[PDB]
Design a protein around this ligand. Sequence first.
Ligand SMILES: CC(C)(C)c1ccc(N(C(=O)c2c[nH]cn2)[C@@H](C(=O)NC2CCCCC2)c2cccnc2)cc1
Ligand SMILES: [Cl-]
Ligand code: NA
Ligand code: NA
Lengths: 305, 306
Amino acid sequence: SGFRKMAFPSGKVEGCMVQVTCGTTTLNGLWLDDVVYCPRHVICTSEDMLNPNYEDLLIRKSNHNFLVQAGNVQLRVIGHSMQNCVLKLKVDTANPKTPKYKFVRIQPGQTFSVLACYNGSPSGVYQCAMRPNFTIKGSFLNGSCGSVGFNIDYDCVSFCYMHHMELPTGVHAGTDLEGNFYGPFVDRQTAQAAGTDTTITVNVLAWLYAAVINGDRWFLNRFTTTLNDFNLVAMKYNYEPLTQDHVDILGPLSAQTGIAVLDMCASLKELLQNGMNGRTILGSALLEDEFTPFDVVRQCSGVTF
Amino acid sequence: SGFRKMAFPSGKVEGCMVQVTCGTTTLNGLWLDDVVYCPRHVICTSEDMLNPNYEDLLIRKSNHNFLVQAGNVQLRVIGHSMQNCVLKLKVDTANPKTPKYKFVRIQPGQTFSVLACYNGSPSGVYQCAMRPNFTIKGSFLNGSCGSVGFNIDYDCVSFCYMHHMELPTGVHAGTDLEGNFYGPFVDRQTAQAAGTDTTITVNVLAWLYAAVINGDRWFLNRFTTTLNDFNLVAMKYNYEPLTQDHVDILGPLSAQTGIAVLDMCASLKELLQNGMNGRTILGSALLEDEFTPFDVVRQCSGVTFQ
Ligand SMILES: CC(C)(C)c1ccc(N(C(=O)c2c[nH]cn2)[C@@H](C(=O)NC2CCCCC2)c2cccnc2)cc1
Ligand SMILES: [Cl-]
Ligand code: NA
Ligand code: NA
């Protein structure tokens, strides 16, 4: 028993982190087979970053403009190209620690583990979710660009996030590993801002199920509701609409606990309307929305990799 | 910016996890050099749960009564010995993935990363603290015994916890890697229960300093406090006493932010009195106590957002 914010074991990813230097800029890269992936803004000076022409800045660059360091070994760069906002550096050595992997683009509301790195060296691991406004509430300092986010299925690492920038509210934006940004953001020093965010309803319901499984039942009541009525409450409180697909996904937890989703929705409706009355749920005074239904089942069942 | 429960990268520990089987019982072991460490209760049967004599149970075992599996490889046990509540199995192969490591016994309030494992396979990593009542509030299912807690400051793995059992309230008890339990717990099915827990005051203060470093000051006030008056108030909310050692430990964070330690104590007294009036601190609506002063310095910028 117990319930904790839990990350995937990070070993398979640690063995892929390297340091990439171009001029005076050092950041992190991801070394898979004979290619290193990193943010393309590594090629920019501060001057360039105000209005970069990435097409022109890269053609100016050649293989010898890049230094790649794997622990204490220099990797020789033998080719370079760009895919969207990701720079790809071909190196002369395949990473012998390359795991089975895929590049996957995730949806808002989905969670992943982040391996925060500095100068190519892993520093910490934490769990976070892609927010509805396509930012992540990370923990990142200068030099963290190129840190990655991932999930694991058995032996296969699914890379879903590469870190590029911090927004003025202190939240973070990045790309998938094909270099496509999450959210309406660009890799240039210009006025940018997180949009207003919403709460991930299906995840809050999943966490309420986790609380019931762990013995926290005070918020349960005799009432049920409908999707239409509940979604009018959700809109009022800036919660994401609940769809029939969300209800289906929660089906397992509904069967295990005896609380139909619309039964639990009736609890959540009451918690939104009335508050928590000084009580906590799984040790939180807020309604937690960065556990997916899968995360709850995994943690309540002990799935291993 | 940001502030997260942040674990250490777990790879160096993943390479040490193995499965140990004795009879019908399977749990996790830690393979370092040519020794596998695991809870000695792996040798207990169903009728041994209440009053096992581990000396008598162990003398009946041969080396080949222990099955150790490292991924797909069976390791051969060539000796065994018991140290306090840990079993040490000598195997015929040194672990080629053994990191630089040490064993350390921690004090209440200290934090560490936990690599939760089942059948020798890692499942997840999270951060924990040793509570003042010598329990940890973990996430552990059946078969998690032998999972370990650790820190990795400066490329050396300091192992500080091995998981042994769950108490009635759902919190967890275990040993250091010399097999000495944290707290008064014993490896017996006994009516044993965690004591009343308390809040780790020095950690709450560290986390308030983290909030100031990351740019928030709304909870400060114009007052100060003596150390004794602070403790007299805080203990009425079931907070641990703050010692001069704790005041000294907070010096560097006090220096980085310009907020005297006893002035931050005055802020905490007022937060206990008032609540947060609908606000949050670093994303939380409660006062967080599982970040140490060292943890805050590890994770936060060395430059305050003034
Ligand atoms: C023999 C002894 C010392 C009484 C014992 C027995 C079982 C286990 N537990 C194993 O899961 C387990 C043991 N061997 C393989 N798995 C579990 C456990 O503590 N239940 C307790 C139930 C109440 C009475 C005391 C034991 C466990 C569950 C979840 C997380 N952590 C551990 C621990 C200790
Ligand atoms: Cl300590
Ligand atoms: Na590849
Ligand atoms: Na209900």
